[PDB]
PDB file of N, CA and C and ligand atoms in Angstrom:
ATOM      1  N   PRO A 582      86.510  99.055 111.829  1.00 32.88           N
ATOM      2  CA  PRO A 582      86.967  98.403 110.565  1.00 32.88           C
ATOM      3  C   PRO A 582      88.139  97.498 110.834  1.00 32.88           C
ATOM      4  N   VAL A 583      88.208  96.444 110.055  1.00 32.27           N
ATOM      5  CA  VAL A 583      89.297  95.453 110.194  1.00 32.27           C
ATOM      6  C   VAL A 583      90.476  95.832 109.293  1.00 32.27           C
ATOM      7  N   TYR A 584      91.665  95.746 109.883  1.00 30.07           N
ATOM      8  CA  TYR A 584      92.910  95.918 109.128  1.00 30.07           C
ATOM      9  C   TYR A 584      93.780  94.672 109.260  1.00 30.07           C
ATOM     10  N   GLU A 585      94.696  94.515 108.309  1.00 31.94           N
ATOM     11  CA  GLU A 585      95.611  93.390 108.317  1.00 31.94           C
ATOM     12  C   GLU A 585      96.511  93.507 109.529  1.00 31.94           C
ATOM     13  N   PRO A 586      96.751  92.395 110.182  1.00 34.02           N
ATOM     14  CA  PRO A 586      97.775  92.391 111.229  1.00 34.02           C
ATOM     15  C   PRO A 586      99.172  92.535 110.609  1.00 34.02           C
ATOM     16  N   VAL A 587      99.835  93.698 110.885  1.00 37.03           N
ATOM     17  CA  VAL A 587     101.124  93.988 110.286  1.00 37.03           C
ATOM     18  C   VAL A 587     102.143  94.199 111.398  1.00 37.03           C
TER      19      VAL A 587
ATOM     20  N   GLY B1440     111.677 112.600  94.479  1.00 34.19           N
ATOM     21  CA  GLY B1440     110.720 111.917  93.538  1.00 34.19           C
ATOM     22  C   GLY B1440     109.399 112.575  93.465  1.00 34.19           C
ATOM     23  N   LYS B1441     108.480 112.009  92.628  1.00 33.71           N
ATOM     24  CA  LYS B1441     107.125 112.589  92.585  1.00 33.71           C
ATOM     25  C   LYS B1441     106.434 112.369  93.921  1.00 33.71           C
ATOM     26  N   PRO B1442     105.864 113.397  94.475  1.00 33.57           N
ATOM     27  CA  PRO B1442     105.170 113.206  95.770  1.00 33.57           C
ATOM     28  C   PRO B1442     104.060 112.148  95.687  1.00 33.57           C
ATOM     29  N   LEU B1443     103.834 111.523  96.861  1.00 34.47           N
ATOM     30  CA  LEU B1443     102.785 110.517  96.959  1.00 34.47           C
ATOM     31  C   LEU B1443     101.484 110.965  96.366  1.00 34.47           C
ATOM     32  N   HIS B1444     101.012 112.178  96.752  1.00 34.29           N
ATOM     33  CA  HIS B1444      99.664 112.579  96.353  1.00 34.29           C
ATOM     34  C   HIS B1444      99.520 112.771  94.855  1.00 34.29           C
ATOM     35  N   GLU B1445     100.607 112.880  94.098  1.00 30.51           N
ATOM     36  CA  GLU B1445     100.548 112.958  92.672  1.00 30.51           C
ATOM     37  C   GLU B1445     100.635 111.624  91.968  1.00 30.51           C
ATOM     38  N   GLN B1446     100.887 110.546  92.697  1.00 33.19           N
ATOM     39  CA  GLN B1446     101.015 109.227  92.055  1.00 33.19           C
ATOM     40  C   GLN B1446      99.684 108.797  91.469  1.00 33.19           C
ATOM     41  N   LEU B1447      99.692 108.074  90.360  1.00 33.36           N
ATOM     42  CA  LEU B1447      98.447 107.743  89.678  1.00 33.36           C
ATOM     43  C   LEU B1447      97.595 106.825  90.555  1.00 33.36           C
ATOM     44  N   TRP B1448      98.235 106.075  91.444  1.00 32.14           N
ATOM     45  CA  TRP B1448      97.574 105.082  92.299  1.00 32.14           C
ATOM     46  C   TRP B1448      97.281 105.637  93.660  1.00 32.14           C
ATOM     47  N   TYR B1449      97.440 106.931  93.897  1.00 35.67           N
ATOM     48  CA  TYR B1449      97.051 107.547  95.175  1.00 35.67           C
ATOM     49  C   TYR B1449      95.668 108.193  95.040  1.00 35.67           C
ATOM     50  N   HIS B1450      94.713 107.722  95.821  1.00 34.07           N
ATOM     51  CA  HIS B1450      93.337 108.114  95.673  1.00 34.07           C
ATOM     52  C   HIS B1450      92.830 109.098  96.752  1.00 34.07           C
ATOM     53  N   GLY B1451      93.655 109.444  97.721  1.00 33.72           N
ATOM     54  CA  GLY B1451      93.196 110.392  98.743  1.00 33.72           C
ATOM     55  C   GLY B1451      92.029 109.831  99.587  1.00 33.72           C
ATOM     56  N   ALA B1452      91.114 110.690  99.910  1.00 32.37           N
ATOM     57  CA  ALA B1452      90.052 110.379 100.892  1.00 32.37           C
ATOM     58  C   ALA B1452      88.889 109.600 100.274  1.00 32.37           C
ATOM     59  N   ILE B1453      89.195 108.454  99.747  1.00 34.90           N
ATOM     60  CA  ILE B1453      88.124 107.567  99.249  1.00 34.90           C
ATOM     61  C   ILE B1453      87.752 106.591 100.328  1.00 34.90           C
ATOM     62  N   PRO B1454      86.459 106.304 100.526  1.00 33.81           N
ATOM     63  CA  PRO B1454      86.061 105.326 101.545  1.00 33.81           C
ATOM     64  C   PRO B1454      86.183 103.904 101.077  1.00 33.81           C
ATOM     65  N   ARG B1455      86.090 102.976 102.042  1.00 32.88           N
ATOM     66  CA  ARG B1455      86.199 101.569 101.716  1.00 32.88           C
ATOM     67  C   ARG B1455      85.165 101.103 100.649  1.00 32.88           C
ATOM     68  N   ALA B1456      83.952 101.620 100.707  1.00 33.21           N
ATOM     69  CA  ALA B1456      82.945 101.214  99.707  1.00 33.21           C
ATOM     70  C   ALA B1456      83.421 101.502  98.312  1.00 33.21           C
ATOM     71  N   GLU B1457      84.138 102.629  98.115  1.00 34.62           N
ATOM     72  CA  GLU B1457      84.663 102.978  96.791  1.00 34.62           C
ATOM     73  C   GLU B1457      85.847 102.102  96.445  1.00 34.62           C
ATOM     74  N   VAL B1458      86.713 101.792  97.360  1.00 33.27           N
ATOM     75  CA  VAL B1458      87.797 100.853  97.112  1.00 33.27           C
ATOM     76  C   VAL B1458      87.293  99.562  96.505  1.00 33.27           C
ATOM     77  N   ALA B1459      86.182  99.013  97.066  1.00 32.43           N
ATOM     78  CA  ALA B1459      85.667  97.742  96.579  1.00 32.43           C
ATOM     79  C   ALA B1459      85.077  97.846  95.195  1.00 32.43           C
ATOM     80  N   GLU B1460      84.705  99.046  94.814  1.00 33.86           N
ATOM     81  CA  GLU B1460      84.218  99.239  93.420  1.00 33.86           C
ATOM     82  C   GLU B1460      85.391  99.395  92.460  1.00 33.86           C
ATOM     83  N   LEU B1461      86.527  99.932  92.943  1.00 33.72           N
ATOM     84  CA  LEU B1461      87.648 100.287  92.042  1.00 33.72           C
ATOM     85  C   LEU B1461      88.584  99.092  91.835  1.00 33.72           C
ATOM     86  N   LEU B1462      88.723  98.191  92.817  1.00 32.43           N
ATOM     87  CA  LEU B1462      89.628  97.084  92.617  1.00 32.43           C
ATOM     88  C   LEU B1462      88.861  95.889  92.083  1.00 32.43           C
ATOM     89  N   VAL B1463      89.413  95.187  91.071  1.00 32.89           N
ATOM     90  CA  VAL B1463      88.663  94.234  90.258  1.00 32.89           C
ATOM     91  C   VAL B1463      89.303  92.846  90.263  1.00 32.89           C
ATOM     92  N   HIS B1464      90.636  92.769  90.117  1.00 32.34           N
ATOM     93  CA  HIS B1464      91.361  91.523  90.052  1.00 32.34           C
ATOM     94  C   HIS B1464      92.331  91.421  91.179  1.00 32.34           C
ATOM     95  N   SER B1465      92.709  90.158  91.563  1.00 34.00           N
ATOM     96  CA  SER B1465      93.676  89.926  92.604  1.00 34.00           C
ATOM     97  C   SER B1465      94.990  90.645  92.306  1.00 34.00           C
ATOM     98  N   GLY B1466      95.493  91.350  93.290  1.00 36.18           N
ATOM     99  CA  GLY B1466      96.740  92.134  93.107  1.00 36.18           C
ATOM    100  C   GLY B1466      96.518  93.523  92.584  1.00 36.18           C
ATOM    101  N   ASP B1467      95.287  93.897  92.223  1.00 36.66           N
ATOM    102  CA  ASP B1467      94.974  95.311  92.019  1.00 36.66           C
ATOM    103  C   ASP B1467      95.178  96.023  93.351  1.00 36.66           C
ATOM    104  N   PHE B1468      95.746  97.221  93.340  1.00 35.98           N
ATOM    105  CA  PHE B1468      95.952  97.969  94.546  1.00 35.98           C
ATOM    106  C   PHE B1468      95.799  99.459  94.345  1.00 35.98           C
ATOM    107  N   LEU B1469      95.592 100.133  95.445  1.00 36.16           N
ATOM    108  CA  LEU B1469      95.674 101.574  95.489  1.00 36.16           C
ATOM    109  C   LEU B1469      96.184 101.957  96.866  1.00 36.16           C
ATOM    110  N   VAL B1470      96.696 103.184  97.019  1.00 34.00           N
ATOM    111  CA  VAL B1470      96.997 103.779  98.314  1.00 34.00           C
ATOM    112  C   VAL B1470      95.994 104.941  98.514  1.00 34.00           C
ATOM    113  N   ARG B1471      95.555 105.076  99.769  1.00 38.55           N
ATOM    114  CA  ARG B1471      94.570 106.079 100.103  1.00 38.55           C
ATOM    115  C   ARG B1471      94.859 106.675 101.474  1.00 38.55           C
ATOM    116  N   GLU B1472      94.171 107.799 101.726  1.00 38.73           N
ATOM    117  CA  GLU B1472      94.115 108.288 103.064  1.00 38.73           C
ATOM    118  C   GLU B1472      93.279 107.391 103.957  1.00 38.73           C
ATOM    119  N   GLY B1473      93.643 107.312 105.222  1.00 39.46           N
ATOM    120  CA  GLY B1473      92.808 106.614 106.181  1.00 39.46           C
ATOM    121  C   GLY B1473      91.415 107.196 106.220  1.00 39.46           C
ATOM    122  N   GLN B1474      90.445 106.347 106.556  1.00 36.86           N
ATOM    123  CA  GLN B1474      89.063 106.762 106.735  1.00 36.86           C
ATOM    124  C   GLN B1474      88.722 106.879 108.186  1.00 36.86           C
ATOM    125  N   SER B1475      88.759 105.787 108.929  1.00 39.53           N
ATOM    126  CA  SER B1475      88.472 105.784 110.364  1.00 39.53           C
ATOM    127  C   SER B1475      89.703 106.147 111.225  1.00 39.53           C
ATOM    128  N   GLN B1476      90.805 106.301 110.573  1.00 39.81           N
ATOM    129  CA  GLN B1476      92.099 106.569 111.269  1.00 39.81           C
ATOM    130  C   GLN B1476      92.999 107.363 110.311  1.00 39.81           C
ATOM    131  N   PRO B1477      94.047 107.988 110.786  1.00 37.93           N
ATOM    132  CA  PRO B1477      94.734 109.001 109.963  1.00 37.93           C
ATOM    133  C   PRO B1477      95.864 108.518 109.105  1.00 37.93           C
ATOM    134  N   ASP B1478      96.333 107.295 109.269  1.00 37.56           N
ATOM    135  CA  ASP B1478      97.485 106.826 108.519  1.00 37.56           C
ATOM    136  C   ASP B1478      97.104 106.349 107.134  1.00 37.56           C
ATOM    137  N   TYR B1479      98.075 106.374 106.209  1.00 38.78           N
ATOM    138  CA  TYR B1479      97.891 105.886 104.868  1.00 38.78           C
ATOM    139  C   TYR B1479      97.597 104.377 104.870  1.00 38.78           C
ATOM    140  N   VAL B1480      96.848 103.946 103.860  1.00 36.99           N
ATOM    141  CA  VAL B1480      96.437 102.535 103.747  1.00 36.99           C
ATOM    142  C   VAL B1480      96.733 102.078 102.307  1.00 36.99           C
ATOM    143  N   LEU B1481      97.344 100.898 102.227  1.00 34.98           N
ATOM    144  CA  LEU B1481      97.530 100.185 100.997  1.00 34.98           C
ATOM    145  C   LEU B1481      96.420  99.140 100.942  1.00 34.98           C
ATOM    146  N   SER B1482      95.476  99.336 100.045  1.00 35.50           N
ATOM    147  CA  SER B1482      94.342  98.424  99.881  1.00 35.50           C
ATOM    148  C   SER B1482      94.576  97.585  98.637  1.00 35.50           C
ATOM    149  N   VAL B1483      94.415  96.256  98.795  1.00 35.74           N
ATOM    150  CA  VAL B1483      94.772  95.312  97.723  1.00 35.74           C
ATOM    151  C   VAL B1483      93.642  94.291  97.632  1.00 35.74           C
ATOM    152  N   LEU B1484      93.203  94.001  96.419  1.00 35.34           N
ATOM    153  CA  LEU B1484      92.175  92.989  96.230  1.00 35.34           C
ATOM    154  C   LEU B1484      92.846  91.602  96.275  1.00 35.34           C
ATOM    155  N   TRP B1485      92.285  90.677  96.988  1.00 35.28           N
ATOM    156  CA  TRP B1485      92.824  89.328  97.041  1.00 35.28           C
ATOM    157  C   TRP B1485      91.647  88.361  97.038  1.00 35.28           C
ATOM    158  N   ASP B1486      91.547  87.533  96.019  1.00 35.46           N
ATOM    159  CA  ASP B1486      90.505  86.547  95.923  1.00 35.46           C
ATOM    160  C   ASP B1486      89.118  87.142  96.170  1.00 35.46           C
ATOM    161  N   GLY B1487      88.908  88.294  95.580  1.00 37.27           N
ATOM    162  CA  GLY B1487      87.582  88.908  95.537  1.00 37.27           C
ATOM    163  C   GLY B1487      87.266  89.918  96.649  1.00 37.27           C
ATOM    164  N   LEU B1488      88.138  90.021  97.667  1.00 33.67           N
ATOM    165  CA  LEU B1488      87.872  90.859  98.804  1.00 33.67           C
ATOM    166  C   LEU B1488      89.040  91.857  99.017  1.00 33.67           C
ATOM    167  N   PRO B1489      88.770  93.137  99.287  1.00 34.52           N
ATOM    168  CA  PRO B1489      89.896  94.040  99.615  1.00 34.52           C
ATOM    169  C   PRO B1489      90.471  93.723 100.958  1.00 34.52           C
ATOM    170  N   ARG B1490      91.814  93.849 101.022  1.00 36.49           N
ATOM    171  CA  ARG B1490      92.557  93.717 102.249  1.00 36.49           C
ATOM    172  C   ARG B1490      93.302  95.055 102.493  1.00 36.49           C
ATOM    173  N   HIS B1491      93.232  95.535 103.721  1.00 39.29           N
ATOM    174  CA  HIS B1491      93.667  96.922 104.023  1.00 39.29           C
ATOM    175  C   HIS B1491      94.877  96.856 104.977  1.00 39.29           C
ATOM    176  N   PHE B1492      96.007  97.351 104.521  1.00 37.68           N
ATOM    177  CA  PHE B1492      97.246  97.332 105.226  1.00 37.68           C
ATOM    178  C   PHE B1492      97.618  98.786 105.603  1.00 37.68           C
ATOM    179  N   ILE B1493      97.651  99.064 106.890  1.00 39.55           N
ATOM    180  CA  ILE B1493      98.094 100.423 107.308  1.00 39.55           C
ATOM    181  C   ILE B1493      99.633 100.499 107.101  1.00 39.55           C
ATOM    182  N   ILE B1494     100.012 101.568 106.393  1.00 37.11           N
ATOM    183  CA  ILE B1494     101.445 101.846 106.182  1.00 37.11           C
ATOM    184  C   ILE B1494     101.955 102.526 107.448  1.00 37.11           C
ATOM    185  N   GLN B1495     102.908 101.908 108.113  1.00 38.85           N
ATOM    186  CA  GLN B1495     103.492 102.475 109.332  1.00 38.85           C
ATOM    187  C   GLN B1495     104.466 103.564 108.960  1.00 38.85           C
ATOM    188  N   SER B1496     104.480 104.648 109.715  1.00 42.75           N
ATOM    189  CA  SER B1496     105.415 105.812 109.531  1.00 42.75           C
ATOM    190  C   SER B1496     106.189 105.913 110.827  1.00 42.75           C
ATOM    191  N   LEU B1497     107.524 105.834 110.725  1.00 45.40           N
ATOM    192  CA  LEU B1497     108.327 106.059 111.924  1.00 45.40           C
ATOM    193  C   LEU B1497     109.735 106.362 111.516  1.00 45.40           C
ATOM    194  N   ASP B1498     110.388 107.231 112.283  1.00 44.64           N
ATOM    195  CA  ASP B1498     111.786 107.507 112.116  1.00 44.64           C
ATOM    196  C   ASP B1498     112.140 107.783 110.665  1.00 44.64           C
ATOM    197  N   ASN B1499     111.301 108.609 110.017  1.00 44.23           N
ATOM    198  CA  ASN B1499     111.558 109.070 108.685  1.00 44.23           C
ATOM    199  C   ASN B1499     111.479 107.955 107.644  1.00 44.23           C
ATOM    200  N   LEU B1500     110.816 106.810 108.016  1.00 45.35           N
ATOM    201  CA  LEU B1500     110.674 105.686 107.098  1.00 45.35           C
ATOM    202  C   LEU B1500     109.216 105.289 107.108  1.00 45.35           C
ATOM    203  N   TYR B1501     108.886 104.500 106.064  1.00 47.85           N
ATOM    204  CA  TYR B1501     107.578 103.859 105.912  1.00 47.85           C
ATOM    205  C   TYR B1501     107.773 102.380 105.746  1.00 47.85           C
ATOM    206  N   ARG B1502     106.887 101.573 106.376  1.00 48.41           N
ATOM    207  CA  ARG B1502     107.075 100.131 106.291  1.00 48.41           C
ATOM    208  C   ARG B1502     105.719  99.441 106.520  1.00 48.41           C
ATOM    209  N   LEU B1503     105.733  98.147 106.157  1.00 50.62           N
ATOM    210  CA  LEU B1503     104.694  97.199 106.555  1.00 50.62           C
ATOM    211  C   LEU B1503     105.335  96.318 107.663  1.00 50.62           C
ATOM    212  N   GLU B1504     105.807  95.116 107.315  1.00 48.02           N
ATOM    213  CA  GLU B1504     106.503  94.286 108.309  1.00 48.02           C
ATOM    214  C   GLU B1504     107.970  94.039 107.948  1.00 48.02           C
ATOM    215  N   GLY B1505     108.485  94.651 106.889  1.00 46.36           N
ATOM    216  CA  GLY B1505     109.835  94.428 106.481  1.00 46.36           C
ATOM    217  C   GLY B1505     110.658  95.676 106.484  1.00 46.36           C
ATOM    218  N   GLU B1506     111.306  95.980 105.362  1.00 46.31           N
ATOM    219  CA  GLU B1506     112.245  97.056 105.264  1.00 46.31           C
ATOM    220  C   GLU B1506     111.521  98.417 105.466  1.00 46.31           C
ATOM    221  N   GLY B1507     112.293  99.383 105.926  1.00 46.29           N
ATOM    222  CA  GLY B1507     111.811 100.772 105.977  1.00 46.29           C
ATOM    223  C   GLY B1507     112.267 101.501 104.731  1.00 46.29           C
ATOM    224  N   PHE B1508     111.400 102.281 104.108  1.00 46.26           N
ATOM    225  CA  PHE B1508     111.647 102.990 102.911  1.00 46.26           C
ATOM    226  C   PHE B1508     111.490 104.510 103.177  1.00 46.26           C
ATOM    227  N   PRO B1509     112.287 105.348 102.497  1.00 42.65           N
ATOM    228  CA  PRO B1509     112.178 106.795 102.737  1.00 42.65           C
ATOM    229  C   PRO B1509     110.903 107.438 102.155  1.00 42.65           C
ATOM    230  N   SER B1510     110.136 106.682 101.357  1.00 41.89           N
ATOM    231  CA  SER B1510     108.853 107.224 100.839  1.00 41.89           C
ATOM    232  C   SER B1510     107.923 106.037 100.543  1.00 41.89           C
ATOM    233  N   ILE B1511     106.631 106.384 100.457  1.00 40.82           N
ATOM    234  CA  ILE B1511     105.660 105.322 100.092  1.00 40.82           C
ATOM    235  C   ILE B1511     105.789 104.942  98.637  1.00 40.82           C
ATOM    236  N   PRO B1512     106.055 105.831  97.665  1.00 38.58           N
ATOM    237  CA  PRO B1512     106.260 105.354  96.302  1.00 38.58           C
ATOM    238  C   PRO B1512     107.424 104.360  96.206  1.00 38.58           C
ATOM    239  N   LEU B1513     108.506 104.548  96.992  1.00 37.61           N
ATOM    240  CA  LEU B1513     109.614 103.567  96.949  1.00 37.61           C
ATOM    241  C   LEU B1513     109.173 102.205  97.523  1.00 37.61           C
ATOM    242  N   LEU B1514     108.408 102.199  98.611  1.00 37.27           N
ATOM    243  CA  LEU B1514     107.837 100.970  99.149  1.00 37.27           C
ATOM    244  C   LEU B1514     106.994 100.258  98.079  1.00 37.27           C
ATOM    245  N   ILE B1515     106.093 101.023  97.424  1.00 37.86           N
ATOM    246  CA  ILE B1515     105.188 100.407  96.438  1.00 37.86           C
ATOM    247  C   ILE B1515     105.999  99.838  95.263  1.00 37.86           C
ATOM    248  N   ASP B1516     106.998 100.572  94.764  1.00 37.24           N
ATOM    249  CA  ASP B1516     107.754 100.124  93.630  1.00 37.24           C
ATOM    250  C   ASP B1516     108.598  98.876  93.973  1.00 37.24           C
ATOM    251  N   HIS B1517     109.066  98.848  95.239  1.00 35.32           N
ATOM    252  CA  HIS B1517     109.792  97.654  95.683  1.00 35.32           C
ATOM    253  C   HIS B1517     108.890  96.443  95.719  1.00 35.32           C
ATOM    254  N   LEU B1518     107.715  96.588  96.304  1.00 31.86           N
ATOM    255  CA  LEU B1518     106.771  95.478  96.339  1.00 31.86           C
ATOM    256  C   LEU B1518     106.416  94.960  94.945  1.00 31.86           C
ATOM    257  N   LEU B1519     106.244  95.892  93.984  1.00 30.28           N
ATOM    258  CA  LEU B1519     105.889  95.503  92.655  1.00 30.28           C
ATOM    259  C   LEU B1519     107.085  94.820  91.970  1.00 30.28           C
ATOM    260  N   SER B1520     108.316  95.285  92.197  1.00 30.77           N
ATOM    261  CA  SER B1520     109.452  94.803  91.509  1.00 30.77           C
ATOM    262  C   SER B1520     109.900  93.434  92.045  1.00 30.77           C
ATOM    263  N   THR B1521     109.700  93.194  93.351  1.00 28.95           N
ATOM    264  CA  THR B1521     110.137  91.957  93.945  1.00 28.95           C
ATOM    265  C   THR B1521     109.027  90.919  93.975  1.00 28.95           C
ATOM    266  N   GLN B1522     107.760  91.372  93.923  1.00 28.27           N
ATOM    267  CA  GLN B1522     106.642  90.468  94.079  1.00 28.27           C
ATOM    268  C   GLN B1522     106.650  89.798  95.451  1.00 28.27           C
ATOM    269  N   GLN B1523     107.339  90.386  96.437  1.00 28.20           N
ATOM    270  CA  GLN B1523     107.284  89.744  97.720  1.00 28.20           C
ATOM    271  C   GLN B1523     105.959  90.014  98.422  1.00 28.20           C
ATOM    272  N   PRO B1524     105.447  89.086  99.215  1.00 31.87           N
ATOM    273  CA  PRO B1524     104.164  89.266  99.896  1.00 31.87           C
ATOM    274  C   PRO B1524     104.299  90.446 100.838  1.00 31.87           C
ATOM    275  N   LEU B1525     103.212  91.204 100.968  1.00 31.32           N
ATOM    276  CA  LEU B1525     103.166  92.349 101.865  1.00 31.32           C
ATOM    277  C   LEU B1525     103.408  91.911 103.307  1.00 31.32           C
ATOM    278  N   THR B1526     102.829  90.771 103.646  1.00 30.44           N
ATOM    279  CA  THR B1526     103.157  90.186 104.949  1.00 30.44           C
ATOM    280  C   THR B1526     103.200  88.654 104.733  1.00 30.44           C
ATOM    281  N   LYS B1527     103.999  87.968 105.554  1.00 26.07           N
ATOM    282  CA  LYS B1527     104.050  86.523 105.455  1.00 26.07           C
ATOM    283  C   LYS B1527     102.669  85.890 105.743  1.00 26.07           C
ATOM    284  N   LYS B1528     101.988  86.475 106.680  1.00 25.62           N
ATOM    285  CA  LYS B1528     100.686  85.939 107.116  1.00 25.62           C
ATOM    286  C   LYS B1528      99.643  86.019 105.987  1.00 25.62           C
ATOM    287  N   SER B1529      99.698  87.111 105.205  1.00 21.57           N
ATOM    288  CA  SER B1529      98.682  87.321 104.213  1.00 21.57           C
ATOM    289  C   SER B1529      98.976  86.654 102.895  1.00 21.57           C
ATOM    290  N   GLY B1530     100.233  86.625 102.432  1.00 19.47           N
ATOM    291  CA  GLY B1530     100.550  86.145 101.141  1.00 19.47           C
ATOM    292  C   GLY B1530     100.168  87.083  99.995  1.00 19.47           C
ATOM    293  N   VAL B1531      99.696  88.256 100.307  1.00 18.39           N
ATOM    294  CA  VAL B1531      99.147  89.202  99.271  1.00 18.39           C
ATOM    295  C   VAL B1531     100.341  89.841  98.551  1.00 18.39           C
ATOM    296  N   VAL B1532     100.191  89.931  97.226  1.00 14.92           N
ATOM    297  CA  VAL B1532     101.276  90.492  96.355  1.00 14.92           C
ATOM    298  C   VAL B1532     100.641  91.573  95.519  1.00 14.92           C
ATOM    299  N   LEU B1533     101.404  92.658  95.301  1.00 14.13           N
ATOM    300  CA  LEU B1533     100.933  93.696  94.371  1.00 14.13           C
ATOM    301  C   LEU B1533     101.234  93.299  92.924  1.00 14.13           C
ATOM    302  N   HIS B1534     100.281  93.469  92.036  1.00 16.96           N
ATOM    303  CA  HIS B1534     100.431  93.247  90.610  1.00 16.96           C
ATOM    304  C   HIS B1534     100.215  94.487  89.758  1.00 16.96           C
ATOM    305  N   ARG B1535      99.186  95.284  90.057  1.00 13.77           N
ATOM    306  CA  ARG B1535      98.920  96.432  89.187  1.00 13.77           C
ATOM    307  C   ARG B1535      98.184  97.504  89.897  1.00 13.77           C
ATOM    308  N   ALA B1536      98.497  98.747  89.488  1.00 12.47           N
ATOM    309  CA  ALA B1536      98.130  99.966  90.127  1.00 12.47           C
ATOM    310  C   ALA B1536      96.857 100.498  89.496  1.00 12.47           C
ATOM    311  N   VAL B1537      95.830 100.677  90.345  1.00 12.34           N
ATOM    312  CA  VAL B1537      94.540 101.184  89.875  1.00 12.34           C
ATOM    313  C   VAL B1537      94.552 102.703  89.951  1.00 12.34           C
ATOM    314  N   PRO B1538      94.209 103.367  88.842  1.00 14.76           N
ATOM    315  CA  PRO B1538      94.291 104.837  88.821  1.00 14.76           C
ATOM    316  C   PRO B1538      93.146 105.469  89.512  1.00 14.76           C
ATOM    317  N   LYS B1539      93.407 106.654  90.041  1.00 11.14           N
ATOM    318  CA  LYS B1539      92.363 107.437  90.695  1.00 11.14           C
ATOM    319  C   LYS B1539      91.295 107.798  89.672  1.00 11.14           C
ATOM    320  N   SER B1540      90.058 107.711  90.091  1.00  7.93           N
ATOM    321  CA  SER B1540      88.910 107.908  89.156  1.00  7.93           C
ATOM    322  C   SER B1540      88.946 109.278  88.518  1.00  7.93           C
ATOM    323  N   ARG B1541      89.601 110.228  89.181  1.00 13.05           N
ATOM    324  CA  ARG B1541      89.699 111.598  88.667  1.00 13.05           C
ATOM    325  C   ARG B1541      91.035 111.827  87.940  1.00 13.05           C
TER     326      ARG B1541
HETATM  327 CL1   CL C 270     102.269 113.759  99.233  1.00 15.04          CL
HETATM  328 CL1   CL C 271      82.939 102.905 103.524  1.00 15.31          CL
HETATM  329 NA1   NA C 272     108.839  98.568  90.414  1.00 19.07          NA
END
């Protein structure tokens, strides 16, 4: 799954 | 303060498919348990698509890319009160808290 780059 | 799991916008172990059904307008958000990983996630609708931000936990603080807060409710209330973007790269802003279906 893709997550926001944080 | 009121524990995270009692907040109206904390949904626990809901999967991404359910997040997409629950968020309707840009800036709608919820916090949930991770699905594929164990950290909490702030999921926010932006221009029709959910965006998923892992809330980092370290040194007794919670953060995205800015300040560290002593709890997730404090982080959320700060984002709502300042309207600052969750990250500079995303431009996403919290506007309103989606209640748990239960
Ligand atoms: Cl909790
Ligand atoms: Cl899913
Ligand atoms: Na607030």
